[PDB]
Amino acid sequence: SDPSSINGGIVVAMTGKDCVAIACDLRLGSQSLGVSNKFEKIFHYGHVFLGITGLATDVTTLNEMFRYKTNLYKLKEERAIEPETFTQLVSSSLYERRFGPYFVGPVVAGINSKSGKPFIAGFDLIGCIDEAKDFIVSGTASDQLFGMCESLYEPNLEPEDLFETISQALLNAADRDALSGWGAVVYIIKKDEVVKRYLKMRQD
Template identity: 60%
Template sequence: MSIMQLNGGSVIAMVGKDCVAIASDLRLGNQALLVASNFEKVFPIHDRLFVGLPGLASDVFTLHEALRFRVNMYRMKEEREIGPETFCHMVSSTLYEKRFGPYFIEPVIAGLPPVTELNPNPKPFIACTDLIGCITTPKDFCVAGTASEKLFGVAEGLWEADLEPEDLFETISQTLLNALDRDALSGWGAVVHVITQTEVTTRYLKSRMD
């Protein structure tokens, strides 16, 4: 068994029209043994940027604190919030520093760049990395965790370009719930964050509890 599958859990991010969504299940397990059903794997970096951390549970806490420290230092030095692309490279370099004894985490990043005079219509940003920080930036969706294969299959069939926030929520929710039904190491509820330029909508979903 891979150490990446010890605690289970899955994360997915999707791009919509001027919005982005990121979702995860809430299960924490020890292989097939359920430990908790309220284990958050998606964390806010600021109002328009979230990171999902599926993988080994102890490394989830360690990496989240390391990233929180670096983001706070960036905020103090630059006197502004970090952008999604910059944060993605920060995550990558943090993971690559530990490449000889890596964090067993495959981060998923989702966010919206700020509206500026130079960039009045910023495009939604999603990215994912492997456990030593190799970045992938798809234009539609990215997945990580034990249900990755199932998430890919369902998302390929359901995702469409330029989805409105409510349609994006429905699409990512159906994708995640259908994939969780087919993966024994993920599930026991889910949480979905839909990010727009004006607000973040967070909803908790009920799923199969077996």
């Protein structure tokens, strides 16, 4: 019954030479019943991306909570928030609710408009932070991802090769996870230009 597995889903992020990639499946279902295949888990505030897994009603609320928050930030500092300055936020945020947590597993990922360096980060429900130079995974097929990433990952891939590696990890774990699938979408984030793509996968 674990609140973090009613709805299902997965998210994964990777870093490459001057870019990052963030990907997720599309399914939202109740227990075994599949309800939707257009449920996206990746949002963005300015040039900062956040993917969220877990209890759907919380995933939605958090997006709204962060949109709200980031808009107020921009207005006050006269600039969009950065990836690190943002991670710190969603961490404190998650924690202010330490004794009635939102049941999620966020994952930030972006590029710093000043330095120009790639960034990816993960957190657990109460907000513990976690940077990594290679990859972040979260979700129901969490283990299947660690297995794929700890094989297919390669430092400094070119954005065109990163797209292939990340896709393949997502694609294959979602096939060994009974509650993740029904489509996927992947993003390739550079300093400028952001390309979004939907992939073709088994619909079972």
